[PDB]
Amino acid sequence: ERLETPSAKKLTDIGIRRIFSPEHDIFRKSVRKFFQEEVIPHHSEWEKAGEVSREVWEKAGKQGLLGVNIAEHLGGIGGDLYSAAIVWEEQAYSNCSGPGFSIHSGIVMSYITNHGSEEQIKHFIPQMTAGKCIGAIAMTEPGAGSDLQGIKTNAKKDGSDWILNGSKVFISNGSLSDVVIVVAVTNHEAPSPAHGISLFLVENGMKGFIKGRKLHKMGLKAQDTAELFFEDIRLPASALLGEENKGFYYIMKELPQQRLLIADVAISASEFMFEETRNYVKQRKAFGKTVAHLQTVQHKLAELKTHICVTRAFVDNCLQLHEAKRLDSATACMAKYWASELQNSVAYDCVQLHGGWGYMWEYPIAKAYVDARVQPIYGGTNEIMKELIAREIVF
Amino acid sequence: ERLETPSAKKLTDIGIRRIFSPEHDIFRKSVRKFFQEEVIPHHSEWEKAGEVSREVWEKAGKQGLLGVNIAEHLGGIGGDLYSAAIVWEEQAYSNCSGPGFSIHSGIVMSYITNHGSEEQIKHFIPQMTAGKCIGAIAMTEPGAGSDLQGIKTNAKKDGSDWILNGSKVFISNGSLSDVVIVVAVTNHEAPSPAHGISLFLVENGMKGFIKGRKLHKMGLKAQDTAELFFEDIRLPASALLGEENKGFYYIMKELPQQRLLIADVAISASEFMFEETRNYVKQRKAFGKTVAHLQTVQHKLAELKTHICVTRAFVDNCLQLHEAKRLDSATACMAKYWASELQNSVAYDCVQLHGGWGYMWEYPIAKAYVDARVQPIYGGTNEIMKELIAREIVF
Amino acid sequence: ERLETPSAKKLTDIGIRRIFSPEHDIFRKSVRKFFQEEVIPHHSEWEKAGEVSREVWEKAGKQGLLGVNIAEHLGGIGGDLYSAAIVWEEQAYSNCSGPGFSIHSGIVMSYITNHGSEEQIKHFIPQMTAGKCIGAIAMTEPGAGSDLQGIKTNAKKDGSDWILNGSKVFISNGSLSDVVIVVAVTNHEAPSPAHGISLFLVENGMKGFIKGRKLHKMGLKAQDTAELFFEDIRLPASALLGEENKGFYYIMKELPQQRLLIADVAISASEFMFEETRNYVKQRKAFGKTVAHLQTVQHKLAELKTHICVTRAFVDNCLQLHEAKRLDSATACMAKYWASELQNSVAYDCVQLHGGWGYMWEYPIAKAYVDARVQPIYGGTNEIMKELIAREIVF
Amino acid sequence: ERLETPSAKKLTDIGIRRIFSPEHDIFRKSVRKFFQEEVIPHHSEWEKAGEVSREVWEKAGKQGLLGVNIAEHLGGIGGDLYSAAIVWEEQAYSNCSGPGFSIHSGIVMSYITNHGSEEQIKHFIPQMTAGKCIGAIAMTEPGAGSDLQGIKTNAKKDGSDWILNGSKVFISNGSLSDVVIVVAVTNHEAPSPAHGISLFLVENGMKGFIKGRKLHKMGLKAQDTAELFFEDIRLPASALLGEENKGFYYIMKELPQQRLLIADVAISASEFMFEETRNYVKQRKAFGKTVAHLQTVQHKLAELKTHICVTRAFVDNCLQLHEAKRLDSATACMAKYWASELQNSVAYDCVQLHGGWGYMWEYPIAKAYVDARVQPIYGGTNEIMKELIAREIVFD
Ligand SMILES: Cc1cc2nc3c(=O)[nH]c(=O)nc-3n(C[C@H](O)[C@H](O)[C@H](O)COP(=O)(O)OP(=O)(O)OC[C@H]3O[C@@H](n4cnc5c(N)ncnc54)[C@H](O)[C@@H]3O)c2cc1C
Ligand SMILES: Cc1cc2nc3c(=O)[nH]c(=O)nc-3n(C[C@H](O)[C@H](O)[C@H](O)COP(=O)(O)OP(=O)(O)OC[C@H]3O[C@@H](n4cnc5c(N)ncnc54)[C@H](O)[C@@H]3O)c2cc1C
Ligand SMILES: Cc1cc2nc3c(=O)[nH]c(=O)nc-3n(C[C@H](O)[C@H](O)[C@H](O)COP(=O)(O)OP(=O)(O)OC[C@H]3O[C@@H](n4cnc5c(N)ncnc54)[C@H](O)[C@@H]3O)c2cc1C
Ligand SMILES: Cc1cc2nc3c(=O)[nH]c(=O)nc-3n(C[C@H](O)[C@H](O)[C@H](O)COP(=O)(O)OP(=O)(O)OC[C@H]3O[C@@H](n4cnc5c(N)ncnc54)[C@H](O)[C@@H]3O)c2cc1C
Ligand SMILES: CCCCCCCCCCCC(=O)O
Ligand SMILES: CCCCCCCCCCCC(=O)O
Ligand SMILES: CCCCCCCCCCCC(=O)O
Ligand SMILES: CCCCCCCCCCCC(=O)O
């Protein structure tokens, strides 16, 4: 009944890929409509402002695009992993990297609902599903980003409170965030920092919580990445997320999802770029016929489509495993690493096929190129992905 | 209940991969035992001889390894495509490329049962399933392989018999074949040679049918490959396979299975090489530790394992599609091309990891390296695969 | 005597490479000071402005960095090719791509003093060497860049004047230019586009000459690139550069220098990126020790340094050949193609070695990454380079 | 007044590349003639025997191909480094990896003349220059090839004699060698073998010296590679090459020439494959034209030609530096590593361009493919090459 991407008219067609159902296709169509009409037309302006509007967040919240795979009885929408993936994919197909929906719904809401108390869940989830409370997660610091145990941010108890001090960097949704999950060292006496880390829900408005100026980056112009500062912030007992000192444990449990998320975003962006480029060369007149008639272009496009389809098959297998809660760390790392790498190889060749116009911001491929470059870096660099993958091979 | 290759203890473990059932596992174990006892111990001798014995072929037929996925009511063993794939895979896992079982079972027996008459099927299939009648297919000629329009071998109608003249090169199982499917032009006056070709079943013993000497090759030392010559062979009317002048149609229908076969053999060979090399470096002492303790080696193995697992996912997806009769030519070409390229990339890096010993015929990786080099060439060059894949992209 | 880049303390050290003299080093040192003191400190401002100041051009001219290798008695600065290259290289080593000096001096001024008259050489060369007259070169058009036959810009002659019409795209120095060498079709009923093309000097001010607004690109933020328009510009008889319909001949003779120029800039930017990155990883610590101590990082740096040094050797060989006026089109195409691809390969790996900081505009590697991507596109795409290189191989 | 490979009619043409002179071109034509007439016609037979004839060695000696760049007053032919390189290159252009000439002349004879005694030089060099005494060098052992400290072969002083025990593997010219420079531990009491290693001249015939049978390899079919065993061989004081415990110092001084040698052989092999393949596709008919008319084939050839030419330029700069005795270990490592890697990349693409025929031993490209695979491994693996190169990048 369903075709796989290689046989589809377009890698981005609706109604394809075996892991989806007819009900998923319907939802897919609506999400695609949302990005096409509510995101794509305002993106150029958000790029200029360096951030998206609160309006689109509330719009996404109203249409039900936030907290999709978060249990309904907890304040989420209640869909399965496949529905949540559709939202990641469609955003990638729109080539609009500004809105930080997936970090919000795929990571932050996930930590809160999986390890938060009943009161934290009741206080945050509905607001986040509505898109009125924007979430962010802050682990990385100026001195440590792959070496989590090297974290310096710290929190020390003062009765029932916690005095939080330190700073984070490269925080997505940094500017617009209303709630930020902060990783901090709570036990300087623990044997290893891995046994002395906790998670704290820091809210915009607490005294001492300062948001730095938006960072100037080579890409992701509309994503408000920023530095965060904590100045002797007195945090109520309710700010502590999960058990004290069990923070590393919670991060480890959530990592697999974060990696698969990045992986699907990466391969979806590649499918976008391929179709975008396919279209360009078949339209670009040259030597009387289209650039698409040149043999070298045809072989190049074949190479790109093959690698893209091969990788999508693996990512879809991972989405299936994760749905069944059977996707382990190593497999998640393979997907993240291989897909993020492919995304940059595809972007590079696709810009080339566009000639000079590929270097112009007017053309989508231009921003696809700079937006792609960040994927092999965040969420655990690919060097780290290979390290983790090698553990089961040699040890 | 079933792990995929990334999570298994070894990429070659039995009981892994969701496309197989526990009944397939029982069968795989038995086939693996067969190669371990009836092929591996005698392969060195066969390399020297330049061909395997008739004995192993008959043992294979008796044990039920030939004609798997060939209709039982047609004289085959029956069983699904997955069972047939298990035999391709296990031969790859044994690193013995001598026995030409794959071409015989997956191609020649296929052409006969799908497009042959009751008489032809009754005459060939049972003895082919028994391993007493070895099959080969001959399309390639000295003048051209990638140029189908350049076939010179021809058959002239003389009364009710066919007069066949010409020659073919690079024919696998060419030396010990008992029946060979020959592609020849039967209508030179046809608009397109694609509509003027026919298939003929030539048997060993006919007058005018001459087998040339075994060709000296860089690898596949035990695979008897040779040139064939047809000198005014008077073929009975029962030598024609299928309808006259529709040979191109039949070839086009079998190609997808041929490409998929090559793809699975390639990815399976890669999995063998990976585990073989993984084992070697964990055992090779160096600098007070094992080569496997070196970070560069760990990352190299991670890269290899990741790419192999990713391709395995696409190939398994292709097997599933083919089992459903839903695998088209373009997808088959993607698997053939991508897997055969990976196979050589893997072999190169695995030889490197063995150091000097990787150049010694004594070590399996050495013959794996030279054996791997033929895959990107036969069954349609990877260059031809790209042209075919590009066809749907631009037209 | 002198050391080559592999043996030097740093690839960018002054006093290395056999093709330079002690006198060249002194010039080198003074050129290095200029960029550090007059370019680097203000580049960020120009990036935001979208163009450099006319002041920096006058400072460059006054200091004798504009028009090197241009005959002194022609109003130039004199000096061999090695001196002109030093200015290209040092601008690369400063990682400041804003000022279009090399085009102005290495391209525009070369055309004027090689195929221009004394009335033109006397008029333009003096003020161009002073940085008061900024030149450009318009060849590429919206319809085609690579397909030379696709030129729509035509110059119908009227009496002794010429009626210029058409448009250009991607014109570097498009905003600051005071004189632009325009390529237009003069002889339409010409057999080949070699007997129908002419070079014109369109000075700023002539009616009908319309400069479009600066183009928004992914990189070269400080390089004013614009679209140029021509709506019936009456051109004097002196506006014609060289012989009518002889443009092709002029361009073909200058192309080598342009290719060598891009190649040296590409390889120099690679040497800069390497030393920048080598320094970064030696000062960055993680998981206990400096990133530079990781074996993977070490081998990566060894690969980068090796490829960079091998390519530098080729480029210097090309500078020598060009000095003796013996660099052909093919050899120059090899240099431009290989060095431009290597530059992006180096940039990618160097961004990865900086981790997240490599994505921040604050770090030089970030702008170096996006600035490098233009090289394989302009000055003739690398695809065109291969075509040209292939011509003598098969034809 | 000379063209660089990029501009020549063929990358293998005589009279090109700035480092050579018209005198060199004359010698070049002569050497090329030697391989076409005395080697090419018999290589197939040698591949089956797994070793070349002692006759081709003596013929090479008589025509002055052995000992080039080995001082004439020392028993060699003399000539500069460029002349010795011509012999390495021409053998590669012939696509005959059988004759172990380069090793014998560019390595073994070099050790002897650069660190041997006047007596050792008198006895060995003359007959080696004549091709009467074939040389081999043995460092690698069963359990250690990239690990120096792993060497187990050892020699103990017994009076003025040396007792040698151990074994080596992968020894080129192993079967027909008359003299072998053996690396052995002479002082394990030292902090590192870098100060406890000595070189010895082991000769065929000495009691206890055993040659193993020829090893079966994927390529280099006519190159007699073998393992060697030393069983309490009583070596006279004269067997010691150089000073006791200074072996490492000598090996260290010779490595750059060894790496440069492999480097030149690697890039030269690539030049041969390119022209061989270029010829094939221009001659191969397809679609009523030649495979060379396909745009993909043209671009692929341009890519190969460019990389080969870029690498040749670097290798020639290294030849010029070594001529002046100014070639660094790190620089020589860059050449050995980069050229051997490119050689295999070129081999792979060229086999592909030949279609099925590239898999047939009949065609030159097939043996060139398996012959190339050895280069990234011996003379120090490419991984070791990177390690050495990284030293000055990260430390100091
Ligand atoms: C735009 C953007 C958005 C991001 N969003 C978030 C976010 O929302 N929240 C958050 O907390 N962080 C986020 N990050 C930070 C990101 O996760 C880190 O940059 C990333 O984890 C890399 O850490 P680092 O920058 O400290 O690099 P480092 O850890 O310093 O690593 C630098 C280099 O050393 C290499 N290296 C280090 N260790 C090894 C090793 N063991 N083996 C081999 N190589 C190694 C790294 O791979 C890299 O090549 C984001 C970053 C960017 C750029
Ligand atoms: C920032 C920037 C600055 C520039 N500055 C100048 C300048 O100052 N003056 C000037 O005149 N130009 C300049 N250019 C323009 C530049 O020279 C052209 O963009 C370049 O020549 C490519 O032409 P195109 O963009 O039309 O690509 P196209 O010709 O459309 O090519 C598009 C794709 O088709 C491929 N293709 C086309 N022909 C072949 C072929 N025959 N074989 C295989 N593939 C082929 C191309 O390689 C590319 O992959 C600049 C460009 C940029 C981006
Ligand atoms: C045909 C042939 C001819 C030869 N001729 C000679 C000869 O005449 N005389 C002689 O003495 N030797 C010769 N050799 C031997 C050759 O020098 C060695 O095989 C080579 O140095 C590799 O050593 P090894 O085989 O012990 O591999 P090992 O040292 O075991 O290395 C195995 C793998 O580990 C890798 N590795 C080891 N160390 C590191 C590291 N530090 N970092 C990252 N990776 C590492 C190696 O690169 C390789 O990938 C020859 C070899 C062959 C194949
Ligand atoms: C060991 C071995 C076993 C084999 N077994 C069989 C068998 O049993 N029966 C049988 O019939 N055949 C068999 N073959 C033959 C094999 O199918 C052919 O060699 C293969 O199809 C390639 O054809 P060719 O060798 O004629 O190469 P050619 O067609 O000459 O191609 C030569 C080069 O040109 C390239 N080229 C051709 N067309 C294009 C294009 N249009 N665009 C770009 N590049 C192109 C090719 O890819 C290749 O790079 C086998 C081959 C080998 C080596
Ligand atoms: C380019 C838009 C990508 C949106 C999904 C990003 C998912 C990973 C976010 C960063 C996670 C981390 O680094 O902790
Ligand atoms: C390495 C052993 C592979 C055995 C299966 C080979 C299948 C393809 C055989 C050649 C088919 C053809 O080219 O017509
Ligand atoms: C990154 C700065 C490069 C400065 C030198 C550019 C030389 C080529 C300019 C474009 C030439 C052309 O496309 O006609
Ligand atoms: C293909 C023929 C190559 C001839 C030169 C080989 C040079 C390296 C020989 C082995 C050196 C060593 O491993 O000690």
Numbering used by the authors:
A (entry chain C), B (entry chain A), C (entry chain D): 34 to 428
D (entry chain B): 34 to 429
Any passages from the paper?
LCAD substrate specificity overlaps those of VLCAD and MCAD, and in addition includes unsaturated and branched-chain substrates.
In addition, the structure of the Glu291Gln (E291Q) mutant complexed with lauric acid has been determined to 2.0 Å resolution. Although we obtained crystals of the LCAD E291Q mutant co-crystallized with substrate lauroyl-CoA (C12-CoA), density for the CoA moiety is not observed, and only weak electron density of the alkyl chain portion is observed, likely due to hydrolysis of C12-CoA during the crystallization process. The crystal packing of the LCAD E291Q P1 form is very similar to the crystal packing of the wild type LCAD P21 crystal, except that, in the P1 space group, the adenine ring binding site now has moved slightly away from the symmetry related A and B molecules to avoid steric clashes, transforming the P21 space group of wild type LCAD to the P1 space group of the E291Q mutant crystal. The chain starts at Glu34 in all four monomers of the mutant LCAD structure. The structure of the catalytic residue mutant, E291Q, with the lauroyl moiety of C12-CoA bound in the active site shows that Gln291, extending out from helix G, is located at the active site close to the Cα-Cβ bond of the substrate. The LCAD binding cavity is deeper and wider compared to those of other mammalian ACADs, accounting for the lack of specific interactions between the fatty acyl chain of C12-CoA (bound substrate) and cavity-forming residues. Likewise, the overall structure of ligand-bound E291Q LCAD is similar to those of both the ligand bound and unliganded wild-type structures. In all LCAD structures lacking bound CoA derivatives (all eight monomers of mutant LCAD, all four monomers of ligand-free wild type LCAD, and the C and D monomers of the ligand-bound wild type LCAD), residues Ser179 through Gln182 in the vicinity of the CoA moiety of the substrate are relatively disordered in the absence of ligand.
